[PDB]
Amino acid sequence: DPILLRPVDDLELTVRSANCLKAEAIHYIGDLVQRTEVELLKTPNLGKKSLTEIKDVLASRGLSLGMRLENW
Amino acid sequence: DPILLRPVDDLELTVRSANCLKAEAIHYIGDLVQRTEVELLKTPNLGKKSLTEIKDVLASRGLSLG
Amino acid sequence: DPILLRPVDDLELTVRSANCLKAEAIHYIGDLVQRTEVELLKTPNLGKKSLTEIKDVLASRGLSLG
Amino acid sequence: DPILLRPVDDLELTVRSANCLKAEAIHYIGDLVQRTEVELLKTPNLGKKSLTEIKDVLASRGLSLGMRLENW
Amino acid sequence: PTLEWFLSHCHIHKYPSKSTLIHQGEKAETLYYIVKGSVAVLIKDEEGKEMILSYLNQGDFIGELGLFEEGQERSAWVRAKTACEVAEISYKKFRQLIQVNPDILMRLSAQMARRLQVTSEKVGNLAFLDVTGRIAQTLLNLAKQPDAMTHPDGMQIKITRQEIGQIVGCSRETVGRILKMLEDQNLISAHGKTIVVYGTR
Amino acid sequence: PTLEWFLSHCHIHKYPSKSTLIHQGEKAETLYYIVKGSVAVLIKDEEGKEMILSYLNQGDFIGELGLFEEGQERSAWVRAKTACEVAEISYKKFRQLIQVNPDILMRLSAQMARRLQVTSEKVGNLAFLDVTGRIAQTLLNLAKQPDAMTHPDGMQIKITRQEIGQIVGCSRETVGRILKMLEDQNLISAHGKTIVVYGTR
DNA sequence: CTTTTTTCCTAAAATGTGAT
DNA sequence: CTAGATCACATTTTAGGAAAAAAG
DNA sequence: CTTTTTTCCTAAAATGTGAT
DNA sequence: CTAGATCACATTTTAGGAAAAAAG
Ligand SMILES: Nc1ncnc2c1ncn2[C@@H]1O[C@@H]2COP(=O)(O)O[C@H]2[C@H]1O
Ligand SMILES: Nc1ncnc2c1ncn2[C@@H]1O[C@@H]2COP(=O)(O)O[C@H]2[C@H]1O
């Protein structure tokens, strides 16, 4: 799909969140998108607010978390 | 082993856990791996996410806690 | 007993059961009460409602079938 | 009630039916009305058609069968 | 009333006793309404053991569940309890009908309301009561039904033990047992398929 | 859409977690709609043993059953699963609302449709499956719910054994058992209230 | 004469049984 | 420890329709 | 300074146990 | 003969909120 192409930054999310996915090696919304909450929760300095954040932006952009898709 | 020579610090983790090990007198990844979970959990300001973190680094780092 | 003297006929029932008892040679309420249910059920043209009828008259008529 | 006063005949039902309730001692729709189907079925010469009849007329007149009511 | 209107738009078909009106699993595209007759809503399990979900008589709608969400499957089987006349309508045309008059929808939903209430109670029963309890309860319910017969000692009903089994959800033997038991306790009478639950009224 | 309209006519109240929105048995005169939050539909038995009938989240209507027939009682209790905002409307005013627009009724019924389907399936379960079976099934269902958490090995959910007890209708001990059992059979993971049903997705 | 009730009949379906 | 399921089959009961038999 | 994440803490709730 | 309920209680786990501690 077209969205998973552009990088995460396009999500215009909070610093904390960014710096977190950033340090967690997440680049494209295509990676994040297919990542499990439970995982992101282990991510240091990423808490409920930040997590709830990620979900909400993906939700607006029409996406879900822990997405499934082959070949990436 | 050669890695157990390197300092915990050289592991880079999280400020919180850092300061813990640090002021806990854990300078080399040796001193560290020597302790078990229960060992550090008793450390002030070191808890669930902390321990769980310290574990996951040594996870892909071929090192456990024992 | 005095009633067992009276004829079945004097009992007035239903045309069907009548003709049955009648052509079955049951003329006095005696001959009748002498038979049990199973006895008459074998009678041609005498069945469930019939038997059940013949019973209910002797019901309030203080007479059973035995 | 007013209806249970008038006699059964007012029900304008079939001969067979009439002659049956008649011979079964039923006078007022107040008696019939509170009579059980199972009973009426024992009534000689009163069959399903006739029974179904009784019910239907009582049903139209707004009444039921095997009615309940004290003092009659 | 409204109903006359509604029906005038339905196609009508007669289903002979024991026939299947709704076949669980099929594409639900039509709504049915029972003009004359009775029918039985039921579901089976893998092996095929049936479970009677509900009995619907005339005046009831059937296969309404498919109507709100496009392309679903019939929620359960519906077998003709007796021969019965049924009015049918494409869910499509029915929706149209509703626009001109929701009164009709009101009527339909109204039934689902009822049906939920009861089916819910059905759950609480399988949940809280025991076979004797459930069988006990059902004899009461069946006494409620229309085809019930007014009887001097209460209500009389015809239904097999196998049936009550599929209703209350237990074995047919066990029904026979709990049934004899209730007869001793002088609560019901039982002669073959004919049972009389005393106490009704 | 329409909903905005609908709500604009409702009164709004916040119910703190664990509070009771609907009290089974009371006169049903109002209709509710969940704006934010979750809630639990449940019924108890004589002794008081509860049985969870269903979980309703935001978007759901509650206490709709009273609406069609005048003067009935609430069909079951509804406890706030979490703190939640609820829109309320006199059944009266709601009916009026429907006249101006049945679209709304359509929406409501639509839910009952769903609710019947499931509650029906609930019956077939208590009917055909065994505790292991039912518990098995529910872990699947709970994995379906919104509050479910995406987990590497499937879906993760928090719920006590006592709870699953009241869901599937069996004892809490027995749930613990069948639960350990499913863990050996490596089908689910269980750490306290946190369970992970593998296989989802 | 026509209707309705009753009996009568049998392939098919329902039932009981009772210790493990 | 309790509440039901079970299982094969000989035996009992039912559905429902022809037709005799009363009734109108 | 302000937010969000983590640890830390305990009354209260959930749980296991295992033979009958 | 099988599938669950049971029962008291010592022991384990949870809810959820203050507050220390990082981060922005
Ligand atoms: N629990 C229930 N109670 C009553 N009727 C039901 C129940 N479940 C299903 N039905 C009816 O059976 C029908 C089966 O197909 P539908 O889903 O189209 O619609 C269903 C309802 O009409
Ligand atoms: N089986 C069910 N499934 C889902 N919700 C239900 C069920 N039974 C009752 N409810 C809800 O609980 C409410 C209780 O009160 P009401 O009867 O007003 O309306 C009921 C429904 O909103």
Short mmCIF file of N, CA, C and O and ligand atoms in Angstrom, two decimals, chain E residues 22 28 41 53-54 56 61-66 73-76 78 91 115 119, chain F residues 116 120, ligand 1:
data_model
loop_
_atom_site.label_atom_id
_atom_site.label_comp_id
_atom_site.label_asym_id
_atom_site.label_seq_id
_atom_site.Cartn_x
_atom_site.Cartn_y
_atom_site.Cartn_z
N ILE E 22 -36.04 -22.37 6.80
CA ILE E 22 -34.72 -21.75 6.82
C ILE E 22 -33.72 -22.84 7.04
O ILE E 22 -33.89 -23.69 7.92
N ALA E 28 -28.74 -15.33 3.72
CA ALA E 28 -30.01 -14.76 4.16
C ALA E 28 -30.34 -13.55 3.29
O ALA E 28 -29.66 -12.53 3.37
N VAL E 41 -37.43 -23.30 15.70
CA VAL E 41 -36.09 -22.76 15.47
C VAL E 41 -35.18 -23.71 16.23
O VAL E 41 -35.43 -24.00 17.40
N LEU E 53 -34.18 -24.22 19.89
CA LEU E 53 -33.94 -22.86 20.34
C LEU E 53 -35.22 -22.13 20.70
O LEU E 53 -35.25 -21.35 21.65
N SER E 54 -36.27 -22.38 19.92
CA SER E 54 -37.55 -21.74 20.15
C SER E 54 -38.63 -22.23 19.21
O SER E 54 -38.33 -22.77 18.14
N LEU E 56 -41.97 -20.94 17.13
CA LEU E 56 -42.65 -19.74 16.72
C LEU E 56 -43.98 -20.10 16.08
O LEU E 56 -44.07 -21.03 15.28
N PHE E 61 -42.28 -13.37 12.97
CA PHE E 61 -41.44 -13.17 11.80
C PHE E 61 -40.35 -14.25 11.89
O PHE E 61 -40.08 -14.77 12.97
N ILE E 62 -39.72 -14.59 10.77
CA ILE E 62 -38.64 -15.57 10.82
C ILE E 62 -37.55 -15.17 9.86
O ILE E 62 -37.83 -14.63 8.79
N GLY E 63 -36.31 -15.44 10.24
CA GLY E 63 -35.20 -15.08 9.39
C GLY E 63 -35.08 -13.58 9.29
O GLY E 63 -34.85 -13.02 8.21
N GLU E 64 -35.23 -12.91 10.42
CA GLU E 64 -35.14 -11.46 10.46
C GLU E 64 -33.70 -11.03 10.66
O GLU E 64 -33.27 -9.98 10.19
N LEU E 65 -32.94 -11.87 11.35
CA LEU E 65 -31.56 -11.57 11.67
C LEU E 65 -30.67 -11.16 10.50
O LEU E 65 -29.78 -10.31 10.63
N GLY E 66 -30.94 -11.72 9.33
CA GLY E 66 -30.12 -11.38 8.18
C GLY E 66 -30.29 -9.96 7.71
O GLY E 66 -29.35 -9.36 7.20
N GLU E 73 -25.29 -15.29 7.10
CA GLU E 73 -25.89 -16.60 6.90
C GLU E 73 -27.00 -16.80 7.92
O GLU E 73 -27.03 -16.17 8.98
N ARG E 74 -27.94 -17.66 7.58
CA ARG E 74 -29.03 -17.90 8.49
C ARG E 74 -28.46 -18.38 9.80
O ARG E 74 -27.62 -19.27 9.82
N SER E 75 -28.91 -17.78 10.89
CA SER E 75 -28.43 -18.12 12.23
C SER E 75 -28.77 -19.51 12.77
O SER E 75 -28.14 -19.94 13.74
N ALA E 76 -29.75 -20.20 12.17
CA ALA E 76 -30.19 -21.53 12.63
C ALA E 76 -31.23 -22.12 11.72
O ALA E 76 -31.78 -21.42 10.90
N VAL E 78 -34.91 -23.78 10.65
CA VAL E 78 -36.30 -23.57 11.01
C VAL E 78 -37.16 -24.60 10.30
O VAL E 78 -37.37 -24.50 9.09
N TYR E 91 -35.27 -8.97 1.53
CA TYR E 91 -34.88 -8.00 2.54
C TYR E 91 -34.93 -6.61 1.90
O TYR E 91 -35.36 -5.63 2.53
N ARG E 115 -37.75 -12.09 21.89
CA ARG E 115 -36.84 -13.20 21.65
C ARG E 115 -35.53 -13.08 22.39
O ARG E 115 -34.99 -14.08 22.84
N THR E 119 -34.42 -15.90 25.11
CA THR E 119 -33.19 -16.63 24.85
C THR E 119 -32.19 -16.32 25.96
O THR E 119 -31.37 -17.17 26.33
N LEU F 116 -28.91 -11.18 19.41
CA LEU F 116 -29.66 -12.42 19.46
C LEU F 116 -28.73 -13.51 18.95
O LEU F 116 -28.47 -14.49 19.66
N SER F 120 -27.75 -16.63 21.14
CA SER F 120 -28.25 -17.92 20.69
C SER F 120 -27.09 -18.89 20.70
O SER F 120 -27.23 -20.01 21.22
N1 LIG K 1 -32.67 -17.34 19.78
C1 LIG K 1 -33.66 -17.34 18.86
N2 LIG K 1 -34.95 -17.22 19.27
C2 LIG K 1 -35.93 -17.19 18.33
N3 LIG K 1 -35.82 -17.26 17.00
C3 LIG K 1 -34.53 -17.39 16.63
C4 LIG K 1 -33.42 -17.44 17.47
N4 LIG K 1 -32.25 -17.60 16.73
C5 LIG K 1 -32.67 -17.62 15.48
N5 LIG K 1 -34.04 -17.48 15.35
C6 LIG K 1 -34.80 -17.40 14.11
O1 LIG K 1 -34.24 -18.34 13.18
C7 LIG K 1 -33.81 -17.62 12.00
C8 LIG K 1 -32.65 -18.27 11.34
O2 LIG K 1 -32.24 -17.45 10.24
P1 LIG K 1 -32.06 -15.86 10.42
O3 LIG K 1 -30.72 -15.58 11.03
O4 LIG K 1 -32.40 -15.25 9.09
O5 LIG K 1 -33.20 -15.44 11.48
C9 LIG K 1 -33.43 -16.29 12.58
C10 LIG K 1 -34.63 -16.01 13.47
O6 LIG K 1 -35.80 -15.68 12.74
#
